Design a protein around this nucleic acid. Structure first.
Ligand SMILES: O=c1ccn([C@@H]2O[C@H](COP(=O)(O)OP(=O)(O)OP(=O)(O)O)[C@@H](O)[C@H]2O)c(=O)[nH]1
Ligand SMILES: [Mg+2]
Ligand SMILES: [Mg+2]
Lengths: 251, 50, 277, 1340
DNA sequence: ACGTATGCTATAATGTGTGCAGTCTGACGCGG
DNA sequence: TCCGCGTCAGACTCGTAGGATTATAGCATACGTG
């Protein structure tokens, strides 16, 4: 595929494939010439080197290095280990309706509450604004609703505020050690780029307000809203699963 | 060390008392970064079987 | 023993004839007349000559083993067309072939994007002219500075330099440490995300509502012209094929459909709102 | 004291007078490069070395050759000013003279046949600034110094390779600067082996055979000899009394007349002196004793001529009897000892399957090139090429130096190649260590970790350029025609240019240095790393490396290093630390002569530190004499204890040499844990400079040193009166004594005005001097972005109070007043740079016009006709900075668009839109815009308006230069003319253009008038070509990347205010997020009324153990108390004498104050300018370890009429009622870290998608969702929330059906699960099929 | 006709090599 | 079958930062489509 800068970019497979096809076609040419076997031998050894390098480069011998003196990424490599498809592009995923930001204290909040910035929840609940807008009849279509949100007009804040009520959000902190590394709350819109977290559940996350960031996630489906309120709500999660002991102890 | 640190933080460490404090400080914080991976790798190992 | 494909072949050439002047002629004279064994020998013998010529033609496109293979093909074409009757040696004539076959095979399998010889041949003279200039200007020559020495077009020099632009693999580490590649950044052009997908779905469902809200003959004639409901996008003149069969009445009814629809967009809340878009 | 110091003096609580003044910060870097370019005549260094090393190069035949003559540096094409802006390397032309000499073939050496000679360019080398930076593609970058294992020899031992045996196997290793490795190692059976390049393991006698050594010589170089005589019938043996030492008498030991030891008895030291004093030489012995002993030399039968017994063969009874009757009654054997002189080479030869020299070169050749049939030359050439050729091998100076002193040698400087001697000497010391004497070296000692700054590394990379040219020279010379071919046709300039830019770009040491803080710049240039090429790796890095080593003392800082996996490797250099002439580090030390602590200083190497005993700086001098106390706490041999007076040899110079720059700025470091001290110094580097530079009330004194040496300020080259003050520039008139007699003598300093940083922050230089002020040489004229009267000003100090506040300071959370936000004091400035590129696509060229399709008049309001936003125009996310349009190809107008473009009209043209618009979110003020264009296509009208200014502003700027330079030049002539022909007004009648017309009598001053007259003309002619260079470069086309036609670079300047989420900290590692900006109504306040600025959590203190912040607070309060008293007297408008008494009483209070500043010396005017700066608060210096103690701080608090405690009676603002009991209040110098929340927060609903994985991208950079990793996944599995996970695996990530379908369902209100199956898995299926594996989805 | 591709030239020349070498604990898999 | 030595397998989780290559002759008929 071509870059924005007029450059192109190719995967190392294409390069490894051109090594296979060239040598294979050169063998067809030498079998046409009935060349001496000594040469045919080299061609067959080469062909094998290329095939073996295509399947799993760094294994039989030296991995065929390319442009930046680094080894070409082969096929097996895209299925292999951390950097493979399994761990990196299948069990772990970047996810929509997700945002992260510096957290700060929320000593006014109750246990089942957490501060959520307005401009954050704005972008996060984008399809829920367009939905409640068509209902009231303020938007006839969705690109109309898109512009209504963009202009940040006053009455759009009140609609956003409407959908978010009685709607839980997932708050994650890295690293996710135990299940309590994510807990759900009822978002409270606050003007400012900081998330406000409940002091007592700080223990579960191990979240220190020294510049911590927590990922936000919106439960879309009604089942996810029920799951978040039933299982993952902060009030329904008190005791540690490890020990029958309250992890929400004042500190 | 045969000779420990006599002073405290209110009184002030001398130049070495701090140099000595370093040895323990850097190695304690080296095991915060490096040794965490063995324990986090254990979490991974435990999970897969369970 | 030996498990490197390199050293194994390089061993087998090391146990192959090293021909004299009169020997070359004896074999070559029979090789043209087809002795079978003769063509095999002259070739087997001068594999050693191909390797010495491939020791200078490396680090340019393919590997040393890839250069020898294609260098051997040059020695073969040299054997297919050698003149023993001429008093001149073979090693001389074969070198012209082995240097050629290598250069040519590098020019094809070096670049991912197959660059033919014509655009490449010229590029070399532009680059080799840059050498002369660079040494005496002590300044890497511009597209203009190269054009003023050759007295050739500006865009030609520039477009030939555009094809010299090399590639970065999408699987190349960014920052010289396991972090992320270009694929974990570079987005997909073809499919735009749900918001762009639902834009057209909702915009085009709103039009299906606006057409059933127009006239019976006005939404027939307007839709089938643009190819909205019909199968083929016709013109004012071509709407006559269906039932219209008119040139003036089709144009007045097309625009009559659009004028009533322009008031439908002024009232619903678009018109100048959706004009910027 | 100086004038700029007279304006504001810092009270110093130091009691250890500085014998050594802090050196220049930027020194190593500068000196390093100062060696690389330095064209040394003979002592080759840098480039001169690189040429003499590689050159002369000769053809493969050896009939033609290229010889190096001389090289030179041309002045830079583009200077720093220009380079920083355009965006190309600040490099200098490399012109090297080459000489092509060709010989006659049949003739001997016809050297004089064609001595062709010409000058040739090859590559442009990035130069170093005066700051120690390299401008690469418009980025001042720093090449951090590397820390690597020093070449030579090194003895190590895996304390248990096979813990099976648990045997400490000793090994040696010769490390060269260039060349192959040479290792020697034992094994479970103590057989010596050699592994060149750590390849195959070969017996260690095989390498000796290769050096032509017979089995006999090998045994006569390691082991001793045992003389065995067979006299008449009694077998006899020579005894050196000191041999049968610590062994057992296996036989009855009896001499000329006495039995000393009995059978099966230990021979003690008494028995050895018993024998040695009796002068015993010969002893009769049994024949059973030799059974086991090894014969030394060969023994042929005198009679037959055959070997009775070969050298190195265990003797027996029958072999000895065969030798006695052959006719040899003088036998030589080896001295084997299982305890001391060990038999290793002996047992090794029994394993060694080789024979002679030529056969030993075979297995050496069969190791490194296995499979190639070996010849006499191939085997010899290889081995000779390894460690014995001037080409392949080079230990270097350091290599041979360390190599020699490791072997306790004779020479410091010797040969670059390994000699026979060297090899065997190394095997010998390896065997010494194995025996018992000799200790192994350890790598963690800095005596083995050498420092390699840029200049040597630039030299190395420059060699590879020459090596890659060597190839092209030789091959073109031999086969190419001799005569025709010129030397530059064979040279290529790209391989050198590419190999050097490889270093100045891709290298791990070559990176961008922080510039958001003077401390960041200076500490990042003083960074030293072990990583990148020729070093270590996080993957490879151990513990013992990282750990602080007692060698670091005075050399490297114990508390300066990232707390990330790159923790112990990266390290800043110590304050007074400097590089050894060879490479190691060295630290200053006060020599003690005959007890007298002399002021003579000696920089002791890492090696010699261990030798002498070194007293600490805590030790007390007797005011010119010696140590006051008899006992002195000192340190040596890497240990510490008390010693006597005469035993002390050296002493620490200052008390700050242990620490770095980063740590020398922390006050009361002595009262801070090393863990929090590290973080404090790490965050002090992240301190973004504020709007108004506020000086620190609680400093150390190092403040000025940093600000000045950073090269961010503008300090005076020559002292005199400031003729002119201006915001843009400074003009100073030089005094007669300093001013040169030739030139005019008026220095020019055009101050760098507001422009961008590498971290997108403000860079300004404001004049810190008044119009017409007398300034001394080396005084700060303009302050930098984070400096104040020359002293460093990183953050701002404020009244702080330690107490909790309704949990708004929970876990280190910060509660800041609105009054701080009102003063806009923590309001930092951000300078972003958005660029706009006109490219050449396949369809056609792009341009830059105001004509943009589908646009609001609102967007094109801030743009001009050319299509660039006005200077000073405010912009916001969505507004367009620079209008761009690209070509639009075959476009399928969809029926719904063809109708919509036919309804409202506005038919778009054949051109696409891609205008550079302010990124969604950012908002600031455009401060400047710069336009770069190729040399061709006609320009925009705005590009012409900007050319108008540059030109007419340059014409003015140069007019001003020649004008004021004229006035300063005639000012001299006017003074010269008076001396001789004294006439005042009559001379000043007619104009000044006819002054060179007037002269003087035959005098030195007549020659002076001619100098100034023809120098005035020299400037008059110079002015034109100065104008030419400006004019041309303003109309010249800058060279761009292929495809690019022109670029427009925009500079924004946002003013971000502090807000909840912003991260701030002290310098004691006390971190915190601002949680709430409290109303001024609600802020706590003292009985007197003034409120508190920040309210910190007291619980962020005990567990942290960083009590330095509390002392910073207390002193800050005291310091302010004094400013509050001075502020009151200056407001009251009292008197000069009253201020003088109080301020003199303030400066003089400390026990032994270092500075004794008398104010009777200060004039009345000088006192009032001082007091006016002291009113904000008397700035105090607390040296790192020689800081102020409670006695001094509490005494200062009594002067300020402040409480001894430091706790004040506080009242709650919300209420008005007092808090239940006192709280510490004072002024703590806090900082505003770069981690601002506007640059952090992110949100996403749906946006871009990945290329193959088809999951969203990553980061707010590209607008990407948060990653939900496997750990994040297991959490939901644990809860049981199954859809919440499946939702985050499919619709929120890949599932192409799901994501769009779900979107449409949400806007409908029906939040319904609609899964399908992520794309990333459908990829995995085909990927396994592409690997030749049948993987199909087997159905129900 | 325009672009791509194939072809020939004749002093003699006949066996490559290059490049990071404090990672490490743990676990098999062929010989010996 | 058992003990040494070779190759081959992993390495806590999320955020941010930035850049650049060398060279393949020279000219004359052969092969593919508007
Ligand atoms: O490499 C690191 C270092 C630290 N951390 C995490 O960051 C936090 C730093 O340490 P904290 O400041 O959270 O410490 P603490 O509350 O457990 O104890 P005190 O300070 O009160 O004595 C801890 O929660 C630790 O797990 C990491 O996740 N990784
Ligand atoms: Mg934290
Ligand atoms: Mg904490």
């Amino acid at each position: 595929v071509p870059l924005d800068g007029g450059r192109f970019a190719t995967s190392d497979l294409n390069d490894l494939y051109r090594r296979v096809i060239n040598r294979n076609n050169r063998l067809k040419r030498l079998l046409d010439l009935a060349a001496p076997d000594i040469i045919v031998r080299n061609e067959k050894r080469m062909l094998q080197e290329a095939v073996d390098a295509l399947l799993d480069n760094g294994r039989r011998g030296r991995a065929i290095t390319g442009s930046n003196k680094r080894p070409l990424k082969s096929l097996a490599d895209m299925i292999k280990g951390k950097q493979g498809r399994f761990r990196q592009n299948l069990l772990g995923k970047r996810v929509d309706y997700s945002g992260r930001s510096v957290i700060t204290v929320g000593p006014y909040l109750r246990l089942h509450q957490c501060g959520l910035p307005k401009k954050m929840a704005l972008e996060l609940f984008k399809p829920f604004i367009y939905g409640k807008l068509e209902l009231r009849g303020l938007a006839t279509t969705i690109k109309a609703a898109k512009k209504m949100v963009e202009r940040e007009e006053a009455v759009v804040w009140d609609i956003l505020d409407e959908v978010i009520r009685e709607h839980p959000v997932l708050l994650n902190r890295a690293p996710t050690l135990h299940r309590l590394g994510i807990q759900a709350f009822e978002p409270v819109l606050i003007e400012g780029k900081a998330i406000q977290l409940h002091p007592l559940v700080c223990a579960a996350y191990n979240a220190d307000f020294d510049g911590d960031q927590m990922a936000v996630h919106v439960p879309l489906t009604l089942e996810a809203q029920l799951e978040a309120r039933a299982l993952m709500m902060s009030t329904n999660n008190i005791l540690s699963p490890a020990n029958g002991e309250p992890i929400i102890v004042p500190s | 060390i045969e000779t420990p640190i006599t002073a405290n933080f209110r009184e002030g460490l001398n130049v070495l008392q701090y140099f000595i404090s370093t040895h323990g400080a850097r190695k304690g914080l080296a095991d915060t970064a490096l040794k965490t991976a063995n324990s986090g790798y254990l979490t991974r190992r435990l999970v897969d079987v369970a | 023993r030996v498990l490197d494909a390199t050293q194994l072949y390089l061993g087998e050439i090391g146990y192959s004839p090293l021909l004299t002047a009169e020997e070359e002629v004896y074999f070559a004279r029979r090789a043209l007349r087809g002795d079978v064994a003769s063509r095999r020998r002259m070739i087997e013998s001068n594999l050693r000559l191909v390797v010495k010529i491939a020791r200078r033609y490396g680090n340019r496109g393919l590997a040393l083993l890839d250069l020898i293979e294609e260098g051997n093909l040059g020695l073969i074409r040299a054997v297919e067309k050698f003149d023993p009757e001429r008093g001149f040696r073979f090693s001389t004539y074969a070198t012209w072939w082995i240097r050629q076959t290598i250069e040519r095979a590098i020019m094809n399998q070096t670049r991912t994007i197959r660059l033919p010889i014509h655009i490449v041949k010229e590029l070399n003279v532009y680059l080799r002219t840059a050498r002369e200039l660079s040494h005496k200007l002590d300044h890497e020559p511009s597209a203009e500075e190269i054009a003023e020495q050759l007295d050739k077009p500006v865009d030609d020099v520039s477009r030939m330099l555009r094809l010299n632009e090399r590639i970065t693999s999408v699987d190349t580490p960014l920052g010289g440490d396991s972090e992320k590649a270009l694929l974990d950044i570079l987005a997909d052009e073809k499919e735009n995300g749900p918001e762009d997908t639902t834009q057209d779905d909702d915009m085009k469902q709103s039009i299906v509502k606006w057409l059933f809200e127009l006239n019976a003959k006005q939404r027939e004639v307007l839709a089938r012209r643009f190819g909205l409901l019909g199968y083929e996008a016709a013109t004012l003149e071509d709407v006559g094929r269906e039932i219209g069969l008119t040139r003036e009445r089709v144009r007045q009814i097309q625009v009559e459909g659009l004028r009533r629809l322009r008031e439908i967009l002024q009232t619903q809340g678009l018109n100048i709102e959706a004009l910027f878009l | 004291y100086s004038y700029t110091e007279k304006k504001r003096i810092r009270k110093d609580f130091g009691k250890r007078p500085q014998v050594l003044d802090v050196p220049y910060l930027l020194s190593i870097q500068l000196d390093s490069f100062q060696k690389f370019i330095e064209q040394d005549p003979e002592g080759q260094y840098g480039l001169e070395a690189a040429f003499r090393s590689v050159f002369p190069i000769q053809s493969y035949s050896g009939n033609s050759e290229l010889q190096y003559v001389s090289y030179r540096l041309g002045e830079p094409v583009f200077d720093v000013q220009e380079c920083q802006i355009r965006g190309v390397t600040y490099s200098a032309p490399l012109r090297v003279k080459l000489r092509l000499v060709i010989y006659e073939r049949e003739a001997p050496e016809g050297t004089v046949k064609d001595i062709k000679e010409q000058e040739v360019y090859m590559g442009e080398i990035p130069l170093m600034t005066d700051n120690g930076t390299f401008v690469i593609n418009g980025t001042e970058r720093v090449i951090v110094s590397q820390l690597h294992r020093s070449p030579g020899v090194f003895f190590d031992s895996d304390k248990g390779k096979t813990h099976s045996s648990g045997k400490v196997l000793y090994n040696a290793r010769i490390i060269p600067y260039r060349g192959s490795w040479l290792d020697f190692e034992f094994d479970p059976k103590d057989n010596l082996f050699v592994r060149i390049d750590r390849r195959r393991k070969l017996p260690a006698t095989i390498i000796l055979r290769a050096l032509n050594y017979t089995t006999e010589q090998i045994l006569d170089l390691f082991f001793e000899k045992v003389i065995f005589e067979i006299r008449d019938n009694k077998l006899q043996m020579e005894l050196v009394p000191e041999r049968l030492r610590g062994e057992t008498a296996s036989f009855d030991i009896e001499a000329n007349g006495k039995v000393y030891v009995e059978k099966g008895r230990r021979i003690t030291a008494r028995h050895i002196r018993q024998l040695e004093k009796d002068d015993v030489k010969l002893i009769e012995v049994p024949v059973e004793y030799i059974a086991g002993k090894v014969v030394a030399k060969d023994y042929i039968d005198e009679s037959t001529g055959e070997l009775i017994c070969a050298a190195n063969m265990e003797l027996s009874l029958d072999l000895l009897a065969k030798l006695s009757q052959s006719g040899h009654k003088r036998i030589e054997t080896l001295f084997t000892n299982d305890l001391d002189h060990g038999p290793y080479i002996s047992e090794t030869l029994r394993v060694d399957p080789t024979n002679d020299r030529l056969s030993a070169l075979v297995e050496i050749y069969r190791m490194m090139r296995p499979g190639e049939p070996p010849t006499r030359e191939a085997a010899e050439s290889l081995f000779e090429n390894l460690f014995f050729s001037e080409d392949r091998y080079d230990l270097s100076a350091v290599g041979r130096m360390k190599f020699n002193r490791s072997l306790l040698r004779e020479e410091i400087e010797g040969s670059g190649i390994l000699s026979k001697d060297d090899i065997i000497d190394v095997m010998k010391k390896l065997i010494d260590i194995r025996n018992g004497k000799g200790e192994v070296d350890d790598i963690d000692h800095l005596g083995n970790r050498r420092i390699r700054s840029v200049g040597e590394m630039a030299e190395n990379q420059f060699r590879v350029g020459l090596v890659r040219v060597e190839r092209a020279v030789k091959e073109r010379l031999s086969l190419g025609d001799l005569d025709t071919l010129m030397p530059q046709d064979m040279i290529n300039a790209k391989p050198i240019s590419a190999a050097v830019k490889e270093f100045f770009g891709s290298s791990q040491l070559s990176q961008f240095m922080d510039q958001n803080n003077p401390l960041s710049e200076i500490t990042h240039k003083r960074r030293i790393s072990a990583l990148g090429p020729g070093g270590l790796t996080r993957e490879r890095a151990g513990f013992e490396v990282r750990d602080v080593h007692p060698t670091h003392y005075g050399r490297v800082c114990p508390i300066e290093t990232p707390e990330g996996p790159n923790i112990g490797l990266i390290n800043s250099l110590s304050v007074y630390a400097q590089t050894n002439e060879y490479g190691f580090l060295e630290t200053p030390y006060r020599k003690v002569t005959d007890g007298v602590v002399t002021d003579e200083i000696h920089y002791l190497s890492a090696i010699e530190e261990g030798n002498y005993v070194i007293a600490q700086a805590n030790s007390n001098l007797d005011e010119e004499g010696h140590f006051v106390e008899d006992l002195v706490t000192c340190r040596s041999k890497g240990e510490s204890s008390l010693f006597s007076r005469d035993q002390v040899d050296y002493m620490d110079v200052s008390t700050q040499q242990v620490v770095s720059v980063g740590a020398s700025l922390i006050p009361f470091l002595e009262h801070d844990d090393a863990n929090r001290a590290l973080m404090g110094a790490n965050m002090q580097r992240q301190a973004v400079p504020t709007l108004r530079a506020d000086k620190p009330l609680v400093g150390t004194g190092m403040e000025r040193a940093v600000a000045v040496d950073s090269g961010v300020t503008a300090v005076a080259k020559r002292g005199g009166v400031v003729q002119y003050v201006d915001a843009s520039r400074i003009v100073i008139k030089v005094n007669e004594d300093e001013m040169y007699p030739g030139e005019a003598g008026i220095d020019i300093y055009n101050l760098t005005k507001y422009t961008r940083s590498n971290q997108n922050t403000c860079i300004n230089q404001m004049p810190c001097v008044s119009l017409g002020e007398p300034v001394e040489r080396g005084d700060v004229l303009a302050d930098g972005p984070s400096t104040d009267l020359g002293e460093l000003a990183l953050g701002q100090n404020m009244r702080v109070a330690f107490m909790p506040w309704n949990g708004y300071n929970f876990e280190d959370s910060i509660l800041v007043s609105e009054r701080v936000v009102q003063e806009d004091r923590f309001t930092t400035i951000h300078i972003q740079e958005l660029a706009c590129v006109s490219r050449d696509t396949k369809l056609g060229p792009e341009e830059i016009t105001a004509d943009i399709p589908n646009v609001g008049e609102a967007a094109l309001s801030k743009l001009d006709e050319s299509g660039i936003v006005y200077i000073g125009a405010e912009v916001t996310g969505g507004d367009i900075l620079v209008g761009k349009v690209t070509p639009k190809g075959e476009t399928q107008l969809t029926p719904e668009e063809k109708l919509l473009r036919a309804i409202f009209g506005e038919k778009a043209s054949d051109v696409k839109d891609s205008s550079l618009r302010v990124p969604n979110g950012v908002s600031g003020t455009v401060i400047d815009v710069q336009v770069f264009t190729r040399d061709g296509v006609e320009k925009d009208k705005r590009a012409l308006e900007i050319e108008e200014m540059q030109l007419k502003q340059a014409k003015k700027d140069l007019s001003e230069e020649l004008q004021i330079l004229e006035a300063g030049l005639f000012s001299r002539i006017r003074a010269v003319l008076v001396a001789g022909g004294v006439e005042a007004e009559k001379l000043d009648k007619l104009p000044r253009d006819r002054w060179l017309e007037l002269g003087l009598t035959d005098e030195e001053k007549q020659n002076q008038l001619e100098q100034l007259a023809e120098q005035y003309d020299e400037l008059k002619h110079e002015f034109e070509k100065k104008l030419e260079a400006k004019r041309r470069k303003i109309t010249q086309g800058d060279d761009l990347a292929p495809g690019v036609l022109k670029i427009v670079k925009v500079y924004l300047a946002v003013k971000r205010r502090i807000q909840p989420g912003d991260k701030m900290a002290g310098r004691h590692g006390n971190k915190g997020v601002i949680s709430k900006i409290n109303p001024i109504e609600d802020m706590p306040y003292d009985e007197n009324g003034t409120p508190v600025d920040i309210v910190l959590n007291p619980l962020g203190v005990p567990s942290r153990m960083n009590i330095g912040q509390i002392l910073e607070t207390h002193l800050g309060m005291a310091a302010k108390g004094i400013g509050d008293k001075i502020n009151a007297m200056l407001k009251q408008q009292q008197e000069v004498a009253k201020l003088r008494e109080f301020i003199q009483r303030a400066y003089d209070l400390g026990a032994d104050v270092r500075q004794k500043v008398d104010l009777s010396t200060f004039s009345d005017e000088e006192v009032m300018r001082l007091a006016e700066n002291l009113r904000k608060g008397m700035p105090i210096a607390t040296p790192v370890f020689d800081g102020a103690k409670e006695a001094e701080i509490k005494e200062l608090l009594k002067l300020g009429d402040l409480p001894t405690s430091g706790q004040i009676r506080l009242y709650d603002g919300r209420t008005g009622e007092q808090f239940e009991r006192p709280v510490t209040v004072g002024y703590m110098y806090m900082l505003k870290l770069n981690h601002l929340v506007d640059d952090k927060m992110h949100a996403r609903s749906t946006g871009s998608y990945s290329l193959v994985t088809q999951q969203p991208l990553g980061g707010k950079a590209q607008f990407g969702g948060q990653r939900f990793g496997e750990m994040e996944v297991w959490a939901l599995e644990a809860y049981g929330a199954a859809y919440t996970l499946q939702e985050m695996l499919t619709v929120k990530s890949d599932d192409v059906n799901g994501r769009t379908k779900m979107y449409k369902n949400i806007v409908d209100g029906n939040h319904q699960m609609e899964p399908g199956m992520p794309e990333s898995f459908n990829v995995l299926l085909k990927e396994i099929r592409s690997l030749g594996i049948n993987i199909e989805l087997e159905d129900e």
